[PDB]
Amino acid sequence: GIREKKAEYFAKLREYLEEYKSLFVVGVDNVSSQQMHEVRKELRGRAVVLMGKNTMVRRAIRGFLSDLPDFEKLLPFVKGNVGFVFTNEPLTEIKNVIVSNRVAAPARAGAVAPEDIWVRAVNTGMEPGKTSFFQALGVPTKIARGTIEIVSDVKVVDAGNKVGQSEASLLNLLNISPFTFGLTVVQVYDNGQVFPSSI
Amino acid sequence: YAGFLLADPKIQEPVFLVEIQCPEQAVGGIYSVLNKKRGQVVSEEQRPGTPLFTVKAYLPVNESFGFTGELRQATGGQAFPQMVFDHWSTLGSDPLDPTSKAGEIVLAARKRHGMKEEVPGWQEYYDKL
């Protein structure tokens, strides 16, 4: 309600906070609604994940410092699309599961580019008829075994430039991306200790 | 004639069976032309390897005049019709109601043949005794 639902959230927050002394703040951006559900119940023993709006989670552990003021050495890392993984399982197991999901970001939407994106040679396997997509950019196609084959490796997108959906739909609707996207680890907690990404 | 007119008279119209070849890239335009002209699909099958969908459809030879023209304008010239008579179809639309698109037919058929506008009702041909 006015503050009753926002206070249901405060309730589940101190719940997790006191039970677990180890913690994971995780960068959740360009992530997927499915990508989350993947192993959201991975290690039902001690590994859990929860998140909300930061501006309201700052006011929670702000008022959780008259009683147990030892999590004040946590606020500087609540500043973006970041969430939380409460765990007490060995802290090295969790880092190597969370980063290892990586939906692989297929592919673009006329967005911006990393660097020189190149299309290689060798036979694509696409049925001839998708040839229009390959002509659109200018790659010399040639139908070899009933399947489109590129010759003359050419750079499709230049260094970090605005890609066009004609170029995108070639990479996207047909090929590999190679843009890739997973969760990230901004910091760790273990009994009042703020560990960075080290182990 | 009197008994006839008491039996919910209708009329039957000739209905073609239309087969059109066209590539997937343009078969949308086939469907949009059949709709204006009371078409009625029965089949749709891509030929394997080719794009080349074939569409089998039910065109009243009534509406077919101008059709293949309207057809290949809607497919950018890519659609190839081929027709044949299939069956007689009955119109629930009332024949003696000139408003309904069966009375329009009979009303037009009446004028060019050179007789009276709308048909004598069932009252005639009948004798009360």
Binding site: - | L6, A7, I11, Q12, E13, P14, V61, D127, L129
Partner: protein, 129 residues
């Protein structure tokens, strides 16, 4: 080219300009006589959907003879038999009144009592005494 169901001479072309050149060729070389072009007429049929909501009284010019009847539609199954030649008018009945009763929901008592077909004596319109 062929004669229309409704008696028109028909030229069936492939397109509007294929038809253009077929036709002008027809008037100058092949026929060599001035010609008139029309949209073909569509043949229809007249039929009853229902069973003649009241028996048909109809008296004669002298006030002496009166005829009563009701009318109903023949199942398309049947009309496709008469047209395709199962139910002949030149076939003798019983033999023909057998196949009607067993296969069409029909009643052999009626099928023997057929008198004639219609029109032209071989058409799909029956009369039962």
């Amino acid at each position: 080219t062929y004669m229309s169901e409704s008696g028109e001479h028909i030229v069936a072309g492939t397109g509007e300009l294929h038809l253009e050149i077929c036709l002008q060729d027809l008037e100058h070389d092949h026929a060599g006589v001035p010609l008139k072009i029309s949209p073909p007429v569509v043949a229809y049929r007249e039929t009853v959907e229902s069973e003649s909501s009241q028996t048909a009284l109809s008296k004669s010019p002298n006030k002496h003879n009166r005829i009563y009847l009701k009318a109903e539609p023949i199942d398309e199954e049947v009309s496709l038999a008469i047209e395709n030649g199962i139910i002949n008018p030149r076939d003798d009945f019983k033999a023909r009144a057998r196949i009607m009763a067993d296969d069409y929901g029909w009643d052999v008592t009626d099928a023997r009592k057929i008198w004639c077909f219609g029109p032209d004596g071989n058409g799909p319109n029956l009369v039962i005494d």
